[PDB]
Paper text:
The natural enzyme from Kionochaeta sp. lacks the CWBD and we describe its crystal structure. There is one subunit in the asymmetric unit, with two cadmiums, one with full occupancy, coordinated by His29 and His67 from the symmetry-related molecule and by four waters, and a second with an occupancy of 0.23, coordinated by His60 and five waters. There were no close sequence homologues with known X-ray structures for this enzyme. Similar to that of gp13, the Kionochaeta GH184 domain is mostly an α-helix bundle. It can be roughly divided into two subdomains, with one subdomain all α-helical and the second, residues 42–88, containing two (or four in TtGH184 described below) short β-strands and two very short α-helices with connecting loops. There are three poorly ordered ethylene glycol molecules from the cryoprotectant in the KsGH184 structure, two of which are close to the active site. A mutational study confirmed that Glu41 is essential for catalysis. Glu41 corresponds to the suggested catalytic Glu45 in gp13 and is located in the all-α subdomain at the end of helix 2.
Residue numbers in the entry: 3 to 143
Amino acid sequence: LPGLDALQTRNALAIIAEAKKENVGPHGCQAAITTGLTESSLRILANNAVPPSLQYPHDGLGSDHDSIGIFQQRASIYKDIRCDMDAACSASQFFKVMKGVSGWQTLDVATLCQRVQKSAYPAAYQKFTALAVGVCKAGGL
């Protein structure tokens, strides 16, 4: 997919397929891809502060609080570690929260990412929104 390496691509393809399953369209796909790029560079990251995360396949390690997976979901909040460590399932968790945001379908993508993620660094998402448009287009959204 444009602008991604092969490892990022396998993760993005799983996210895109889940976006289609959940019927969230280009806009929803863009929010998930932007978020994954921003949080993990589209990598399923385990975390030694969340020991069960190490039992699932992972692309690398992260050391941000108790965040795990592509979306850096905090294990104290998103307690299903297996789900957090799966590209599609972790994306589904993102999409379900996203769909609770009134007007998500047209809300500025970087803003929407922040509504879902409650990041300390909301401006960070803006760096990846343009790339996300292209990734999602290439994937059929």
